[PDB]
Amino acid sequence: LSHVQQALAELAKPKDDPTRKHVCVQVAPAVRVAIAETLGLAPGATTPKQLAEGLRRLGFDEVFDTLFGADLTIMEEGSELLHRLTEHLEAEPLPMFTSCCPGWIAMLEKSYPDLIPYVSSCKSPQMMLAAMVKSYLAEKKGIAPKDMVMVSIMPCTRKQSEADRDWFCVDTRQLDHVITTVELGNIFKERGINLAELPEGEWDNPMGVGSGAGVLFGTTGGVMEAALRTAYELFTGTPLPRLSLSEVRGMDGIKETNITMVPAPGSKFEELLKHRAAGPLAWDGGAGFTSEDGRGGITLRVAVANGLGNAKKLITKMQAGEAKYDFVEIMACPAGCVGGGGQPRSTDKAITQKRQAALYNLDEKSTLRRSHENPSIRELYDTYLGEPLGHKAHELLHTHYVAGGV
Amino acid sequence: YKVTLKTPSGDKTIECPADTYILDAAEEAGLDLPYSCRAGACSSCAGKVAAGTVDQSDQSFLDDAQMGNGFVLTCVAYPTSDCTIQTHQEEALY
Ligand code: SF4
Numbered sequence A: 001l002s003h004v005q006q007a008l009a010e011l012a013k014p015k016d017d018p019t020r021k022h023v024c025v026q027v028a029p030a031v032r033v034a035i036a037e038t039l040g041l042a043p044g045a046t047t048p049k050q051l052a053e054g055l056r057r058l059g060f061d062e063v064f065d066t067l068f069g070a071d072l073t074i075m076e077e078g079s080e081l082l083h084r085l086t087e088h089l090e091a092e093p094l095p096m097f098t099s100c101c102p103g104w105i106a107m108l109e110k111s112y113p114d115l116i117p118y119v120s121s122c123k124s125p126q127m128m129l130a131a132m133v134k135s136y137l138a139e140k141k142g143i144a145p146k147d148m149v150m151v152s153i154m155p156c157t158r159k160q161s162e163a164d165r166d167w168f169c170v171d172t173r174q175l176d177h178v179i180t181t182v183e184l185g186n187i188f189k190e191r192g193i194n195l196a197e198l199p200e201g202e203w204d205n206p207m208g209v210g211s212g213a214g215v216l217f218g219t220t221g222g223v224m225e226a227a228l229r230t231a232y233e234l235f236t237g238t239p240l241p242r243l244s245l246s247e248v249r250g251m252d253g254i255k256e257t258n259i260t261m262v263p264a265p266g267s268k269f270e271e272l273l274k275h276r277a278a279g280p281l282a283w284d285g286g287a288g289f290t291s292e293d294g295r296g297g298i299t300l301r302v303a304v305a306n307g308l309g310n311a312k313k314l315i316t317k318m319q320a321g322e323a324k325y326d327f328v329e330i331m332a333c334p335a336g337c338v339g340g341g342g343q344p345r346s347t348d349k350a351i352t353q354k355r356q357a358a359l360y361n362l363d364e365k366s367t368l369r370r371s372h373e374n375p376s377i378r379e380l381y382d383t384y385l386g387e388p389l390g391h392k393a394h395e396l397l398h399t400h401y402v403a404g405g406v
Numbered sequence B: 001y002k003v004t005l006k007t008p009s010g011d012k013t014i015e016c017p018a019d020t021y022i023l024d025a026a027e028e029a030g031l032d033l034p035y036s037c038r039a040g041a042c043s044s045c046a047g048k049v050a051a052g053t054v055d056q057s058d059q060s061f062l063d064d065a066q067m068g069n070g071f072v073l074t075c076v077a078y079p080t081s082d083c084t085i086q087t088h089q090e091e092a093l094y
């Protein structure tokens, strides 16, 4: 039976059933926006509350959002990034690649197993939250990990294989079932439940306490952006706004961005570039700059690759030493994450932009919020995690790759 | 070139230009396929070469070994000759 069907089996069992376990589900914002199309509506018509209300009525016990898991990823990946930078200034190498996309990791495991140490060891948002709920939440609520079943709604089919990774176990799964937008939307229609006719429900807090999804009001700008932001703000001491990715002439689908990082006055980072100055991909040393006064800095070269067929033409440019970058994010979708194979198919060649724009409201877009300001995240990183890249973090928040694929 | 596009809903033998990728012609005619990038991004839009001949240069990891087996990126590939090509099937290349 399909993993989706397996979820429906447990859901069919009564809440007070002796063999019924706790079925928690985590949805992604990219799904919440396109889920409306599955009902024949406009992208973004369905509210996050309506979705949660519908899911809870499907038989689920706890409804969480991937945003909470992403908040953790931003912290871990950001810390690993900062680590890679600081260590290079002191004298895991560079460049550093983002690991969220399951399509990208498969390529570095089967096609380019020489870039393994170049990619982050941090796990994906959903895989982080799934591990967190089956541990911290399990212990806090007082439930055995075997009595907890978790489902996730992802806009990509490749996400199931991601959660199907052998070593992704607890302490036989961190994530048991993954359902796509198209499938979820069909289930709603099959049961006769229209999300457009549902009231404003509510989300569950992965912390076990408090009302809400555990996410504060405000966008992060994305995993890569928020990670870079966290590192930048700690390295420079100055706030970082939204990054405007510009397309690279010669490479379609490839966007780059240069971030001028200046060491904060009175920090170890400032002393690094003052006390000293001077793999298949050998770091060029970083694009640095200085002034005639003695104070300079370094500009971080970030690049985003959209598509697996785009990575092939990008890596070859880096191997030749033509395209010099420090941080590169590789996506397995045509544009962002709102255009995965698990997403609905409407008559529009540019339906991706609509979903991307309807991802957040005008207020949410204007209100910037980082993961290091989240009380829930702060608490988790205190009562259970202890510190980023720590023991527990390396256990459930980090992972490894396999040379040859899974 | 008349290409027999195999779909879950049957087949669609439409006319595909030699200068235009089958992907565009498919949806423009009336078929269930994901169209947005075209520059070879997602592998979900990879067709299956059942017979005939197709031409692809800039693609993903599915190179000649896969092409000769029946794997082609219809977003950046066109039929060099009339033939039958499957559409929805990204699992056969994993
Ligand atoms: S982009 Fe496609 S594949 Fe990568 S995470 Fe978002 S959905 Fe999964």
Ligand code: FES
Pocket: A334, B023, B034, B035, B036, B037, B038, B040, B041, B042, B043, B045, B075
């Ligand atoms: S349009 Fe995304 S590859 Fe077919």
